[PDB]
Structure formats: structure tokens, C-alpha cells
Ligand binder design. Structure first.
Ligand SMILES: [Zn+2]
Ligand SMILES: [Zn+2]
Ligand SMILES: [Zn+2]
Ligand SMILES: [Zn+2]
Lengths: 208, 208, 213, 212
């Protein structure tokens, strides 16, 4: 192992070079995302409370992610939760491949369920565009799952200001693109989710 | 919603400025650590595969983290997993506080079990230093847990090259500090864990 | 307190009776995944010999993709105990199904039951074609079919099949008023037979008797 | 395959018999958390009226702090069904305890059982004083004590107590050779009684008869 030594070297050089010269958002992103949230958003370290998992999921009964959410909402009183996906997501491609990759396959079955849920849409899409579309639909679905948590519903019910957001950044331009699901209440969840799916389901003439 | 608008402005300006101008590590870090791993390690982007949760835990039965680990080891063939803690960890402080914070308290009970495991040590330490020591002990314990997973044990059993590391990022100097648990095998895990705890139990003349 | 004291008295009485008036069946041959409501016990339903059932019970008998607890029961049952039959058993008048369908925030359990609500959505057209007082029991039946489908898609079961291990998956429901086990159609000995039977089962359930419309 | 066909014939036979020869107990009054081994069924052990038990079973009857499955059963039982008694029941000759104690990689289940191994090491001094053939049954007992302790530290149970809701936690073990439920000593109606009873139970288990 030389890569560990290289990492210590780079950390030392960075820290030295730098010295020579209340979080407000919960950010839920993917483990294989290339650009850190803070870089994408030009925020100061500490501004974001960050959870990262494979393919940026909010699975209904994932104690890990739900714990981060409950802590953020009920304890940190964070007012904004952002789910950020990205193009060329290895998690998404892994979910779409037909290989048993072992335990991770069970995690990615939730994504496969989303694929089936939108099977009519994705079936009408030319196969090479399907990954990008799934990546976007996934973000929309994860915001919907987040807004359906007991944690978020309760926060809203008691009058706590809390907004949910779902974006995708394209590795080809670094722009965050809103996928259209934005919730500040259960009604705005339902409406913007339906709206967003309808919009995502309009395919360019690369159909069937 | 101004904070969200600001984020889109920063992102746009960032990506414009930027244009006009195989992961090798699994990095398991804390959701409330402030400096991102990518910056701190000053590596090539995409070099890190990142999981972040509250208090950088590898819980034996956490599907989320174990999935990341299995994926990283069995599929990505990553050779280095690093658990990184950090000083002034809100997760650790939360674990040590006697408040019911709701669901997150269940997540942090694993940390409290670690505190009890090392209760004699921590009790001999002045109260204002205990959070600091628990944070370090926690990293050693999480590396131990990681090395005890079926995934890591199997990887080693079949002769796959895989190392586990446990560091703490020090905010006051930006340096990664090795906590001394470094495992390339079950035997090196046992020894370096025992070695690490023994070293961490030497308290500065600030006893009782 | 009196309920507990009475429980010990019931137990002591039964155990002592047994004495002055299981070990041969060390390894169970069936895994029974069922609901925590435990209306009619599996033993009563099946009249199997003592020890033959390995049992997991959770709210509304779910096999959630990423549930470490259930997946652990399944993996141990299949890879360690070498069980060749897994049965998912639902039941009518299921409190979990009823809670899942109710709008109330019951707290933590709502998150567990969101998986059943997803299933409800997944078959919303069909369930909307049913009379209101028939919907819970249709959702109970559909739930069981979906859980067999989930079980058969686990890495655990698929790997068992892929390496030639004999394993069958079953999904039944009984009416709590009569105790007759009814097969819901999803029965898998392979990924192919899972696909076919799952598809056929949903198609069959979508052909509504006019009583239920 | 014949086993299944037989099972349906048994069922039809029993159900048919019943017809030509539960609904009054729609809400159970006990939560029974026990092992998937299900050696002597809870109904047989307790002789309760049909429907009185709400049952969760998993390998080696664990209450893991972050297990959504068990915690969901517990929260539904406490907050929704308003159950006032939760019982954790272990049993001798537990395959999960035996698997926990063995060094074999059995795959995924090993991760679930790492929690039992943590308990094994937590009480490593005690368990080393026992004769090898007595260790599994001692770990079974300690396991139950520790799971009651975990249950009583859940946010679900602490909140129930905090708000004044009547709730008791129990931890029993039965010998598969005789069916007598034996109380392992951790019994909590409050956080304070949880602590005292937990400490007392471990102390009592630490006082060894003959078997060294
Ligand atoms: Zn990704
Ligand atoms: Zn932290
Ligand atoms: Zn039920
Ligand atoms: Zn057992």
C-alpha cells in the first residue's frame, strides 16, 4: 500500500498550504458522487449536514438515513433537506445490470422497484437514455419517500418550517438541475410529485 | 427560501468560474464533520467512495453501511477502507448527553455501549476531555466492527488485499491523526485493536 | 402484576402436569414468515410435529428488501438449516394491513407500513374496482403475493437457487373466521417460476368475482 | 413436494373438523419477543386465550438498538395496541446462541449474531468460569437479561414511561427439556427499576453453583 502514504502526504501538504494562506441544510447524496456538495454549492464547511449512501436513497425503514433525518429535523432544526443525485451514477447502473453483486443487490432492489413503477415510461425510452432517466426519476421518488416519513409529516403537522428538494447535477456541466419535486407540506409533496413525474414522462422524439 | 436561491446562484457562479479557468478508498465519515474528505485528502476527484452517517458508525446490522462495504470490497475491489472521525463531533456529544432526542438516540446507543465498554478508562478522565477520548475510542471500535463483518473476514479469507484504517481529523490543524488500528488480516486486527486501546488508555497527568 | 402472575401460574401448572403425567425434531423443515398478530398459531393451522417450524413474525408479514432481521432469518434458514420450504402466511382482519390503509400517524410503525402503502398504490386501479369493505382482505392477499416476490428476489434465495439448492417459496392467507389456508398463487422453485407465478397470481387476482365489485 | 401437500391436508382436516364440531380477543395484552427456533410455542407455555399474544421472533431473540423490524413491533405494541407487558423469552439449546458461539462463517447471519458475541465478551470473565458444556445455557440467560436492558433503553419504551404509560418489561428463559418459564431477574416498570434489576440480575448470574 502506497496510496495510504500518498493520502497522508496530500493531507499534510494541503493543511500546510492552507495555513500559509450551525448547519442549515441536510444534504442527501450518493456515495460515488464525484464533486462534494460544498464544492458544488460554494458553501463553507459546516453549512451542510451530509448523509451519503449508494444511489442517494431514502428507504422507508433504513434506520441509518432516517436517524440522520430525525436528528436534522427535530434536533438541529434544519429547514431544508436536499436530495442530490448525479449522472453517471454507478449505483444506478449497478441497479440496472442483471448481475448478482451480492448483498448490495438487496439495497438496489428499491431502485429496481422504481424502474418497474415507471416501466411503461422507461420501456418507451431508447435503452441508452434509460440510465439518465432513472437517475432523475430516482431523485423524485426519494423526495416522495422523504416527505412520507413520520419524521417529516410530524414536523409539518406541528407547524415546523421544512422544505424538501430533489436535484441532479450533471457531471458534464456542474449545474444543479431541479427535478421538480419540492415540498413544504404534504399537499405540496403530493402535487409537485405528480407534476414532476408527469413532466419527466414527456420524452423527446427518441421514443420506442 | 432565500438559502435555496443562494445555493443555485453559488452553484451557477462556481460552475462558470470553473469552466472559464476508479475509486481506491472507501471513506466512512461523520455526517456532522465539516471539512469534506475530498478536500482534506486533496485527492483526484472520484478517488473516494464515501459513506457518511452520524458518528461514523459501522453497526453490525446496519444494512446501509454494510451494503456500501460489500459493494466497495466485492464489486469495486477497493483495497483500503478508512473510518474517519473528527473532533467536536455533535454525534458523540449527543451520545454522551442525557437528553431524549427521539429516534437518533437509538442510533447513538451503540456509542453509549462503547462508552460503557471503556467506562473505567473514561471515568478516570476529567469530564471535559471525555468527549475527545470517546471520539478516538469510537474510531478504533468502528474499525474493529468493520474487521468483524462477514464481508471483510471473507475478503481476507479468500486472499483479497484489503486494509482498514481508523483516523481522526483534527480541525485545529487539519491533520489526519492515526488512532493505531490498522488491519490487513484478522490477526492484525486483533493485535492492532488491543494495541490501540492500550495506547489510548495512557492518560496525560489529568487523571480522576 | 396479575396478568403476569397468572401467566406463570398457567405455565407452572402445565409444565408440572406434563412431568408427573420435541428433542427428536432438532432441525425444522419449514420457515414460516407471518404476522405478529398471531391470530391462529402456525402450529394449530398446520398440526406439524413439535420443533418443525422455524418462525419469523413481523407487522403484516413483510419481506422488506433491506430488512436485516428478516433477511437474517431467511439466510440462516436456507444456508445453515438447509430448509427447503419458506411459507409467507397472511391473515384476514390484519391490524397491520388496516393501519397501513388508515390515514392516521401512528408514529414509527407508519414507516414500516409505507411498504404496504406502496403495494396499495401499485395495485390502486384493481383495489379501486372493489367494494370498500372487501379492500383490506384484497390488500392482504396482494401483500402476500408481493412478499413472496420480494423473498424470491433476495440475494439469499437467488444464490441458493443458482447453486442448485432445493428451495420452494409459498404464500398463503387464512380467513381468521375459519382457519382454512388458501394459496395465493405465487409459488417459486426458481427465478423463472417466480416470475411466471407472480405475474399469473396478480393476473388471477385481477379477475374479480361480482360479489367483490 | 409432499411436505407441503401434507401440510394443506392437515390444515383442511383440522379446519373442517372444527367447523362441523378468537374474535372476542381482538387486541392482545402481551408482546412476546422470542427466538425463531420456536421450540415450545408461546401458546403452549402460557396457556393464554387465543389472540392475547402479539409475537415477534428473530434469531436468538434480540432487541438490537437499531433494528427497524423489532423496534416497529415494539412501538406499534406500546403506542398503538397499548400493550402493558413485553416479555422477552429465551430458551435452552438455542441454535442462535450455539451459532453465535461457534467460530464458523455462516454468512449474513454472522453479522446479526455479532451482537451476541459482544455480550459474550462483555461477560467474558463470568463465562470463562463455567464448565464449557454449561456456557451456552449461561449465554442464553445473559442474552435475555441484556435484551430486556436494550428494550428498556429504546426511545420507544423510555418515552412511554416518561409520559406515565403503564408498561412492564420481562425476560424469561425455559429449558426445552421441561417447559418451566424461569425469570432471569430483569424486570422494569421504569428506567430506575430497569437499572437496578439489570444490575441485580447480572450479579445473581455471577454467583455460580457447582458448575465450574
Ligand atoms: Zn452515484
Ligand atoms: Zn461528527
Ligand atoms: Zn396481521
Ligand atoms: Zn433459539
Amino acid at each position: 500500500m502506497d496510496k495510504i502514504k500518498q493520502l497522508f502526504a496530500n493531507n499534510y501538504s494541503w493543511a500546510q498550504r492552507m495555513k500559509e494562506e450551525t448547519p442549515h441544510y441536510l444534504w442527501i447524496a450518493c456515495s460515488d458522487s464525484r464533486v462534494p456538495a460544498e464544492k458544488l454549492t460554494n458553501l463553507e464547511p459546516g453549512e451542510l449536514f451530509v448523509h451519503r449512501n449508494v444511489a442517494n436513497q431514502v428507504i422507508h425503514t433504513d434506520f441509518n438515513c432516517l436517524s440522520v433525518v430525525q436528528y436534522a429535523v427535530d434536533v438541529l432544526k434544519i429547514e431544508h433537506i436536499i436530495i442530490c443525485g448525479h449522472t453517471n451514477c454507478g449505483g444506478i447502473h449497478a441497479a440496472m445490470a442483471d448481475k448478482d453483486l451480492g448483498l448490495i443487490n438487496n439495497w438496489l432492489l428499491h431502485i429496481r422497484d422504481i424502474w418497474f413503477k415507471h416501466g411503461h415510461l422507461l420501456g418507451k425510452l431508447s435503452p441508452e437514455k434509460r440510465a439518465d432517466m432513472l437517475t432523475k426519476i430516482n431523485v423524485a421518488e426519494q423526495v416522495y419517500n422523504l416527505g412520507r416519513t413520520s419524521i417529516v409529516k410530524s414536523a409539518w403537522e406541528r407547524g415546523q418550517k421544512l422544505s424538501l428538494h430533489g436535484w441532479v447535477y450533471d457531471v458534464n456541466d456542474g449545474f444543479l438541475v431541479d427535478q421538480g419535486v419540492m415540498a413544504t407540506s404534504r399537499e405540496t409533496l403530493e402535487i409537485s410529485y405528480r407534476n414532476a413525474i408527469a413532466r419527466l414522462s414527456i420524452l423527446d422524439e427518441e421514443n420506442i
